[PDB]
Write a protein that binds this DNA or RNA. Structure first.
Lengths: 49, 49
DNA sequence: TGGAGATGACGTCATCTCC
DNA sequence: TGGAGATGACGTCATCTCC
C-alpha cells in the first residue's frame, strides 16, 4: 500500500534523527566535563593567589 | 518458535536499557550545565576580589 | 567449542500534532 | 476540517560477543 510506503520512510528519517541527537548529546557531556575540569582547576588557582 | 520468543524478550530488555541510558545522559547535561554556571560565576567573583 | 544473549536496523501499527 | 507526517513500542532477522 501507499500510506505504508510513506510511513516506512518517515520511520527511517525519524530513526536517523534520534541517532544524531544521541551523538550530539554524548559529545556535549564530553565537552562540559572538560570545561568543568578547567574551571575547577582555575578556581583552585585563583583561590590560592 | 522458542528462540524467537526469547529474542522478543531480549529485545524488550535491551530497549528498556537504551531508554534509561538516554534519560541518565540528559540529566547529566542538565547537572553539568548548572555546575558550570556556578563555577563561571565563582571565577568572576574571585577574579575581582 | 558451540551456543546464549545483546544489539542495530527494519517495517508495521497506534497514536499525536498541526495546519 | 480532515489529512499529512512524526513518533513510541513492537516483533523479527542479522550479526557480535563471550564463555
Amino acid at each position: 500500500a501507499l500510506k505504508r510506503a510513506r510511513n516506512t520512510e518517515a520511520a527511517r528519517r525519524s530513526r536517523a534523527r534520534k541517532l544524531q541527537r544521541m551523538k550530539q548529546l554524548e559529545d556535549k557531556v564530553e565537552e562540559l566535563l572538560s570545561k568543568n575540569y578547567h574551571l575547577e582547576n582555575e578556581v583552585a588557582r585563583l583561590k590560592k593567589l
